[PDB]
Amino acid sequence: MVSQLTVDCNAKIRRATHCASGAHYGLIENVPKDYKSLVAPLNINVMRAPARAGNGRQQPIGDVIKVAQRLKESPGARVTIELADILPGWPYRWPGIQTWFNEIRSFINDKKKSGLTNFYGNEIWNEPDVTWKDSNGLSFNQMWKQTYDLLRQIDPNEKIIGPSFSWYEENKMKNFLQFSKQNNCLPDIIAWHELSGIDGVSSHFRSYRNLEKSLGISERPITINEYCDENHDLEGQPGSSARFIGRFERYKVDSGMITWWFVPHPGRLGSLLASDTQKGAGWYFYKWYGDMTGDMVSVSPPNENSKLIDGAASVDASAQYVSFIFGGPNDGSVKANFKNLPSFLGSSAHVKVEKIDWKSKDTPSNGPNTIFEKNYSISNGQISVDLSGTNASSGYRIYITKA
Numbered sequence: 466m467v468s469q470l471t472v473d474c475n476a477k478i479r480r481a482t483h484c485a486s487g488a489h490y491g492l493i494e495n496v497p498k499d500y501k502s503l504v505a506p507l508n509i510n511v512m513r514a515p516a517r518a519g520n521g522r523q524q525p526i527g528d529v530i531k532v533a534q535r536l537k538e539s540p541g542a543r544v545t546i547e548l549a550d551i552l553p554g555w556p557y558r559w560p561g562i563q564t565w566f567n568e569i570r571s572f573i574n575d576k577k578k579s580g581l582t583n584f585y586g587n588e589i590w591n592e593p594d595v596t597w598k599d600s601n602g603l604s605f606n607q608m609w610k611q612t613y614d615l616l617r618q619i620d621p622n623e624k625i626i627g628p629s630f631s632w633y634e635e636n637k638m639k640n641f642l643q644f645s646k647q648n649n650c651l652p653d654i655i656a657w658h659e660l661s662g663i664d665g666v667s668s669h670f671r672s673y674r675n676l677e678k679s680l681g682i683s684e685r686p687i688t689i690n691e692y693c694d695e696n697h698d699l700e701g702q703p704g705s706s707a708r709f710i711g712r713f714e715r716y717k718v719d720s721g722m723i724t725w726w727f728v729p730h731p732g733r734l735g736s737l738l739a740s741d742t743q744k745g746a747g748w749y750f751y752k753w754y755g756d757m758t759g760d761m762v763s764v765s766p767p768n769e770n771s772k773l774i775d776g777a778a779s780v781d782a783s784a785q786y787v788s789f790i791f792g793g794p795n796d797g798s799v800k801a802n803f804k805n806l807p808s809f810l811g812s813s814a815h816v817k818v819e820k821i822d823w824k825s826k827d828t829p830s831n832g833p834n835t836i837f838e839k840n841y842s843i844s845n846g847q848i849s850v851d852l853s854g855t856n857a858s859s860g861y862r863i864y865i866t867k868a
Contacts, residue, residue, distance in 0.1 A: 468767050468795035472778045474787060475805035476763035478714060481779050483755050485713045485721035488735030489513040489691050492535060493526045496732025496741050500538055508755030509542040511585045511720035513690050515550030516572045523550035526731050533581045543583050545626060545690055549591035556596035566615060573619050586624030586654055587616050592631035606644050613650040624653040626688060632661040633669040639676055646682055658691040660724055663708055667769045670716040686719035693724035700726050701736030701747035703821050703860025707792030710754060711775035714761050736826040746823040746830040750860035753790050785809050787865040799852040801863055806846045813868035814841045816850055821860040840868040
């Protein structure tokens with residue numbers, strides 16, 4: 466059977482922002498060591514890093530002020546401040562509101578003294594649905610409200626990010642939105658994680674935006690600041706990742722960050738690196754993604770509300786190309802239909818079809834392979850590009866230029 470994806474080059478979503486190009490603890494103080502070869506080429510959007518690292522903190526590495534300084538070499542990039550990781554233990558060992566506030570104030574002082582403004586925002590907590598305990602002496606909503614008021618006083622021009630749920634559920638989100646609207650503590654950027662199973666991801670965006678409408682909340686930017694297939698071993702896998710990229714772009718997600726499931730190995734860009742120093746297959750897939758310029762356009766996949774193959778497409782009238790990247794569970798053949806092809810291609814398009822194969826997150830990769838490359842005659846703005854013998858783990862790209 467044939468898995469079909471249809472790209473409509475006239476159906477502009479928005480400009481290319483590489484919204485899903487980031488990772489939690491994906492960049493740390495000195496891993497990757499080679500910023501220019503391993504980080505800079507990816508056109509990073511937003512990373513995520515702990516507000517503090519080291520003695521007494523959640524992890525020994527990842528200081529966000531040091532990470533933000535590294536990211537200045539990528540002038541468009543930003544980094545999320547994860548305030549929760551001031552605290553040690555999982556679930557976080559709450560030290561009382563007094564120490565929490567002292568630590569936040571000390572961090573904000575250092576933040577301002579750094580002079581950096583490439584932070585994405587202050588994220589108040591992390592997975593309260595996993596880590597907040599009533600025995601802390603106050604509810605999550607209470608800690609949220611109180612910390613929100615603190616942040617507005619001491620860092621008024623910074624965005625506030627949350628509530629950072631481990632998984633999306635409509636009642637949980639609605640309760641939080643209702644609480645936050647009525648008590649004037651709505652986040653500037655809404656945050657949750659998609660690490661529990663990809664099938665429902667798109668339905669979560671639809672649920673969330675319907676909640677904003679039904680509750681009278683002006684539209685918030687969305688950050689999915691941890692995402693991964695339900696199988697942790699697929700972190701950074703090209704095939705799996707193509708579906709998150711496609712769906713995040715389809716719903717105009719502001720930023721998305723890959724999970725950090727493998728705590729022994731921080732600094733690998735979301736398992737895009739096979740080691741601290743070597744690229745994995747995912748690096749090459751995200752490089753294709755980061756290279757996209759122009760407008761993102763609509764991709765119609767077999768079923769975005771499932772595990773099946775999905776992807777994202779860009780059209781650039783100045784560079785004169787179309788790019789379509791895709792991957793995921795499929796029927797073993799793929800038919801990529803293009804409609805309303807750019808008139809700059811005339812009657813003849815040069816089509817290069819490539820794949821990046823994957824063995825595991827820790828397998829080094831030498832890069833993609835060209836499956837085939839040839840010219841296609843364009844009739845009524847349409848071509849169909851067939852790929853045989855496809856799998857669910859490889860990443861694929863169709864790159865269209867003038868013939």
